Design a protein around this ligand. Sequence first.
Ligand code: HEC
Ligand code: HEC
Ligand SMILES: C/C=C(C)/C=C/C=C/C(OC)[C@@H](C)[C@H](OC)[C@@H](C)CCc1oc2c(O)c(OC)cc(OC)c2c(=O)c1C
Lengths: 385, 62, 125, 430, 53
Amino acid sequence: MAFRKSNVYLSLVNSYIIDSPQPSSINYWWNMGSLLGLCLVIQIVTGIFMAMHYSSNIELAFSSVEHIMRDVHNGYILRYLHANGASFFFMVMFMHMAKGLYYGSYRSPRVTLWNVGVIIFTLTIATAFLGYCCVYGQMSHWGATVITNLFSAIPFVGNDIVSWLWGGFSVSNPTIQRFFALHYLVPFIIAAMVIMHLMALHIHGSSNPLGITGNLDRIPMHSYFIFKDLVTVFLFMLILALFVFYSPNTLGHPDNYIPGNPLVTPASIVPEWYLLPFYAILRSIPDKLLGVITMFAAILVLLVLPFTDRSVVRGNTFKVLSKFFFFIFVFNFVLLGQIGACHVEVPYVLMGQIATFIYFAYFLIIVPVISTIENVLFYIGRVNK
Amino acid sequence: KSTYRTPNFDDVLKENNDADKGRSYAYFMVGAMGLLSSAGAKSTVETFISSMTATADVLAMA
Amino acid sequence: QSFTSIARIGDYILKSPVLSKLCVPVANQFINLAGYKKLGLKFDDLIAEENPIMQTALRRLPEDESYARAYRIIRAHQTELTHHLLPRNEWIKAQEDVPYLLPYILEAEAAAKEKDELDNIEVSK
Amino acid sequence: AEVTQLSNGIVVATEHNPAHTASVGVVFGSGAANENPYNNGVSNLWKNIFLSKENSAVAAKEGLALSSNISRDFQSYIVSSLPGSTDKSLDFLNQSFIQQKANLLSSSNFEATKKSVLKQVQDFEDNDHPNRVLEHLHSTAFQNTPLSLPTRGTLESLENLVVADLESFANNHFLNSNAVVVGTGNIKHEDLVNSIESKNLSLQTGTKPVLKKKAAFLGSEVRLRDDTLPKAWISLAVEGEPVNSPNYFVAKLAAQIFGSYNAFEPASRLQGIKLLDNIQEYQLCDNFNHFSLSYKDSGLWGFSTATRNVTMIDDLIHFTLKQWNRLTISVTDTEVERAKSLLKLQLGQLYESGNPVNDANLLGAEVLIKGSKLSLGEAFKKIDAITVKDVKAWAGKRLWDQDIAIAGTGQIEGLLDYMRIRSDMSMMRW
Amino acid sequence: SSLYKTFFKRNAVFVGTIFAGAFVFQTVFDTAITSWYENHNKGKLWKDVKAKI
Ligand code: HEC
Ligand code: HEC
Ligand SMILES: C/C=C(C)/C=C/C=C/C(OC)[C@@H](C)[C@H](OC)[C@@H](C)CCc1oc2c(O)c(OC)cc(OC)c2c(=O)c1C
């Protein structure tokens, strides 16, 4: 028996990245997984390095960040990488989620896999918002404010949970310093959460575009998918470099270059681009509590998918009505995020509400209704009993 | 030595007149241990949680 | 969704002359648009097998049919990974797209359903 | 139906059903439970000399059949013959327990019988693993008590016994107040009771057998590990119910709920037994069987089992004991009704078989303990009477969080520590 | 002991009964200590020096 196999530590590395049996037909959407792994590293490495210069103290916070930009060697490269790496993390995460949502990866025995993934989504969004607060720019302060207040919606203990988090009468020093503390901690949890995502992946292996079994034709992970992955890794770095070096601030908000101020919320306040669709869903409900319940629901609704997809076959590759309605969901999602960047004005409010309906109606009505029809359609189209 | 000839446990085997003695003692102990531990847990948890609530120096009533 | 239920609804549409004429054409059309046929696969191949009922059926599926299914699937992946379709004369034809696995399934579901019933039969004296 | 019983100078009991043969025998109210750790097997010896080649050739010429049986509470000597030759039986029996009680005990016949039960008892301890384990369960469950002594007797006490021991024992035990003459087959009650009242005498009348110390159950285990065996035979039980107990039938029904099973018989696999869904996925055993062993002062409720899945022995135990948990908290009506129907059936196949010696060994047994026999009809009556509330009350007393006795031989490395097993006797609750 | 058999009847103490009891303890136990402690230090405490004023 070979060493890479016999050693206690290399056998793990071996069965995961070298000998791992993969379905020969998996396309490039299967490359998003490793990309996320890379992202987690870029964020973590860049963060720890920047942390050596950061000061969580509210009076020093914003300036320590500028100190990184202006005085630390390659400090700007560190900051722009971390900030943009944060957005790419989401562009990729969304794609990774979409691929699965399309190819029915949330089904069959891979539910636990999907459920772990949903936790990682909730956690990543959290980590991201904790870090956004650390710059303590105008957007920071107000993001810090609004989001913590989301909990003041809880009926009885509400305000108490909120002031507990703040650690004061409002968002002040205690808030920003514990927020950095936590922004450092969660990433390591995400990392742990990832290894579980991997363990859950590893017992059934990846699926494939045909949505059928890949047991008949396997090819090792090494020297195929190790090199195929390399292609996307580079492609990924190439585009991230284009942003970091030639357009570092395009993905950001200008208000964050103005130090946070507790007496003035800027009329230009807008959430980070990756939070918009969710922001939009909340705005579309004129009730305080329902607004937050619906928003959180929009995330939790993804857990429902393995039960509402009644189809007898996996994936959208061979379903005309599903492929259609899938893209209707994708674009709807983009429209949702667009409404979010818009104002609360006449045509947009109603639009936001119609789309919110669609969003939820996708997982609850369309999919089950559509798939049942396709099951029957598939049957009668060839049965002559 | 025959296997049907069970060894002597008369040094440990309790002379029963109160069959449920070992049980009553064990379960009290176990239960008592459990009681104090929930209390200690509740106490540890509250200590940490409350270390986040507003610090003395920030309760400045203006 | 159970095939027991699919066939229950499907047969009913098929058996009625009114519904039949209004659905089947749409059905054959939906099937051609799916395209699995152009990848050399019979729809039954597309059924997901990671569940006991399907395992029971595939286990019960006679050799000839199994080895062929094996080929069809291997063939499909190979084609799919090359980003081509098979040459038209290799495409699974309409009278080939036969529901071969279907009866074994229906039987396996039937057997399962019964056991469940017999495991909860209430008694009345 | 039948079942008559009248005392004279002794006590006669019979139950005749016009069949094909007639069997007569004397059942003594003392067995291994009455032996001492040092003369263990004195009864297996008595049984063996009674069935001796010399003694058998005698009754053979006459056309009689000799059958004996050793148990814990009692033991018997029975003779079968044709319906009319009921007198022929009486002569041979009375000849062997009065006149010839000087013969048979003759050396070279006893020295031969001694070597017979020796290469016999050894053969059992060397090859009949399932029952050897079953006998060891009693050995440990009831250790240092009457019920803890094996019927066939130990292999050491056996080789130390002599004609003096046989006589000694026989004298303090084969009495009149401690005996009941049984007749089963087709011979009328008045046809034997009279034929017995013919030859007078008494033979040590007025003497009662020696008393002792009431059997007891103790949480313990004996692990006869032997990695050379191909399987792993294990037996596990709790303190069960004694004959003539308010729950004699409730207990018997419980065992039937889980019943017995044999992985290799197609029909045994389709049984309406919940535990079966768990045991079959990985084939946790080749067979198991639940019992409700009832003795005079105690009993053993549990199950025996054999498996080749030595790596998953802890799951066999776990699933089983967790199923038993149900009898206290969630056993269902349809589980009980099935049990009844199946109990009435298997209980029926026992009490009414096509063998008189069988009816005999069952008759002598009850009249010796309860001074009467319970009619199968009365049985079925009490059985149909049991409700779920009853099965639950019993489980909460006998099963839920109670000590157990474990016994096993073969590849039992995988059988876990007492405490683990002892802990599956219950379930967590708020 | 027969005191256990009346209260819990040969069944281990339940997890719900444990927590319930755990609360009672917290308050009871605490006050006891607080008191013994204040008393033992009488004359030194602020409550005591505040009275002499
Ligand atoms: C201490 C290590 C550290 C880790 C680990 C870390 N960060 Fe940060 N992060 C920082 C520091 C320091 C800042 C403040 C400087 C800055 O803005 O880059 C920051 C800022 C941010 C910002 C604000 C964007 C901006 O304006 O620069 C975001 C968003 C962010 N982090 C996302 C993430 C995400 C997502 C992860 C993990 C997947 C992560 N961070 C992990 C240290 C870390
Ligand atoms: C909402 C769901 C979800 C989220 C978020 C998610 N995953 Fe996944 N992941 C999946 C599912 C489901 C699969 C299986 C898809 C398949 O192979 O058919 C998967 C598969 C993978 C794969 C295999 C390659 C591939 O893309 O199929 C890796 C590696 C992976 N995920 C890494 C991660 C990492 C690292 C993160 C984030 C830090 C993450 N996942 C977040 C759902 C998710
Ligand atoms: C220590 C951790 C704590 C206390 C709590 C963190 C967890 C909360 C989240 O989920 C993880 C949360 C990020 C939420 O998820 C529902 C996102 C979708 C964000 C939704 C969000 O963002 C905004 C934002 O960024 C803004 O910027 C200036 C401004 C905003 O209005 C002015 C919003 C806003 O109105 C909403 C709804």
